[PDB]
């Protein structure tokens, strides 16, 4: 855990796609989330009760990490990707959002650069992914299929 | 709910594998998590606000149950088991971790005994399960498959 | 213009500048026996176990 947490950040999209579990494992487990799960009492805890302001700040940090995690999982579920780090969809690429070939982006761009190129199309793409899944379920409820 | 919560604890691994929903259902639902979800206000709540230390202790207990649940679910997701109480993997058994035949462990050992036999190989096994899933995804991204 | 489709990836090494609350920690060695030290009481979370970089 955290042995190369953002190690692929400067690498290409292709190479970086091979380290996806590395970042996923660090979204729900900060130091305080490890101390909170010791078999022994952590001892510190009395401090956070005697002084309730510190107790509240710690809980807010823990609750937020959980809420952010769950929201990303909910979107993957809605889009039809329950689990999987990499999933294919039926939404075609518009070639307006970005107009580059596969041999250019997977080999020459980093994920940070990509993110800064299509950031204002994010909501359009997410909207289409949701519509696609709804259409798929409508087709599933037809026993003659395709 | 809680009608035989650890009832299989003294039973064999084989028999105990048939009660897995019994323990799973009790990880997110303690008494306070039921009172918190009443249609009526619980009434007690004012106590936990007037005296903020008790309010904080209760939240810490609730947040922790959620964090522990989610961490186990994240590991199952990483290992390629989204959902399912029982899942098969591609990691071979080493016969060093434990060197017993199937007819000995499934019929004669309890899960508590098993846990005390291979506890210091837990991290090795978990590491291998993650590597296995990453290798599987690398193979999935090949349209000629196997 | 290639016939491509949207693929969703999770666990991508991307970040944005942000403000948040840091939680503080200390090296629980000599400082652990200070007892009445203010900083040794507040920054209670143990750290620096040959920390990663």
């Amino acid at each position, epitope marked *: 855990v955290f042995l190369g947490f953002l190690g692929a950040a400067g690498s290409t999209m*292709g190479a970086a796609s091979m380290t996806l579990t590395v970042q996923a494992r660090n979204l729900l487990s900060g130091i305080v989330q490890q101390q909170s799960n010791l078999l022994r009492a952590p001892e510190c805890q009395q401090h956070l009760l005697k002084l309730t302001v510190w107790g509240i700040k710690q809980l807010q940090a823990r609750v937020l990490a959980v809420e952010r995690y769950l929201r990303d999982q909910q979107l993957l579920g809605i889009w039809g990707c329950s689990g999987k780090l990499i999933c294919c969809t039926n939404v075609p690429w518009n070639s307006s959002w970005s107009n580059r070939n*596969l*041999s250019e982006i*997977w080999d020459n761009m980093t994920w940070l650069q990509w993110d800064k190129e299509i950031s204002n199309y994010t909501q359009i793409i997410y909207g289409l992914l949701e519509e696609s899944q709804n259409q798929q379920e409508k087709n599933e409820q037809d026993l003659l299929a*395709l | 709910v809680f009608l035989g919560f650890l009832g299989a604890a003294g039973s064999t691994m084989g028999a105990a594998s048939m009660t897995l929903t019994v323990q799973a259902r009790n990880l997110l639902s303690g008494i306070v998590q039921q009172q918190s979800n009443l249609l009526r206000a619980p009434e007690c709540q004012q106590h936990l606000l007037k005296l903020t230390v008790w309010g904080i202790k209760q939240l810490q207990a609730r947040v922790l149950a959620v964090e522990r649940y989610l961490r186990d679910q994240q590991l199952l997701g990483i290992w390629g088991c989204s959902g399912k109480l029982i899942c098969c993997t591609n990691v071979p058994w080493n016969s060093s971790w434990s060197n017993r035949n199937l007819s000995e462990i499934w019929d004669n050992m309890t899960w508590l005994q098993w846990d005390k036999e291979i506890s210091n190989y837990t991290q090795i096994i978990y590491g291998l399960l993650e590597e296995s899933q990453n290798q599987q995804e690398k193979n999935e*991204q*090949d*349209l*000629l498959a*196997l | *213009a*290639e*016939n*491509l489709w949207v*693929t969703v990836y999770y666990g991508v090494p991307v970040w944005k500048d942000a403000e948040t609350t840091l939680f503080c920690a200390s090296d629980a060695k000599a400082y652990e026996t200070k007892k009445h030290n203010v900083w040794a009481t507040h920054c209670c979370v143990p750290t620096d176990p040959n920390p990663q970089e």
Partner: antibody, heavy 120, light 105 residues
């Protein structure tokens, strides 16, 4: 970038096994899955024979030859080969060595010149 | 599992040539086209119905889905005399159509 060079008998008799090989230059065949054989038969057109996965040794064969063809590798020689049993006149064809790369990110082929084989 | 049509086209230089290919079963979007000149092994032109292979002139294009596909060559040149093949990439048998010829006069 690789080059594929086929070689083998240009004549096989009825009920004999036909054996053709392909050398690979520029890359390894112990990896790079998708080494394959393609047959071009006058009067029928193109069809696949099958392919091999250099990393595992597994193979897949077109059902018409499920009981007739073997594909295997010589990773030391960095060459691979095709053997078809019980060859008959109907199997006269131009045989090719090919490399098919098909992934989520790239698509390409490399073809060798092939071997024309007469079957009596 | 796919049939091309017509067996042969004969076009004037600069004219646009079109070849159709029909599947017996859906092949989704997994269709490739190849160009085989006499004495040559087939060259990949188009993959996934409309994506050009690296090194292919913009004369070449195509479209279609499911079972109905077309290969188009605009501004046809004498160097395009070849047999064009329709290749199925949506199933295990990977069949090919029979191949059609385009000749420039």
């Amino acid at each position: 970038e690789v080059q594929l060079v086929e070689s083998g008998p240009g004549l096989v008799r009825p009920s004999e096994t036909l054996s053709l090989t392909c050398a690979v230059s520029g890359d390894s065949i112990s990896t790079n899955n998708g080494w394959s054989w393609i047959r071009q038969t006058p009067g029928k057109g193109l069809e696949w024979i099958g392919y091999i996965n250099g990393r595992s040794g597994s193979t897949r064969y077109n059902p018409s030859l499920q009981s007739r063809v073997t594909i295997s590798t010589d990773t030391s020689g960095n060459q691979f080969s095709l053997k078809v049993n019980s060859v008959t006149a109907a199997d006269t064809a131009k045989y090719y060595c090919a490399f098919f790369w098909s992934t989520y990110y790239k698509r390409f082929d490399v073809w060798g010149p092939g071997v024309r084989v007469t079957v009596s | 599992r796919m049939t091309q049509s017509p067996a042969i086209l004969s076009l004037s230089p600069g004219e646009r040539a079109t070849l159709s290919c029909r599947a017996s079963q859906s092949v989704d979007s997994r269709l490739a086209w190849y160009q085989q000149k006499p004495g040559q092994s087939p060259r990949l032109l188009i993959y996934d119905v409309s994506s050009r292979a690296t090194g292919i002139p913009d004369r070449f294009s195509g479209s279609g889905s499911g079972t109905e596909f077309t290969l188009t060559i605009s501004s046809l040149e004498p160097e395009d005399v070849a047999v064009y093949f329709c290749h199925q990439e949506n199933d295990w048998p990977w069949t090919f159509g029979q191949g059609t010829k385009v000749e420039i006069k």
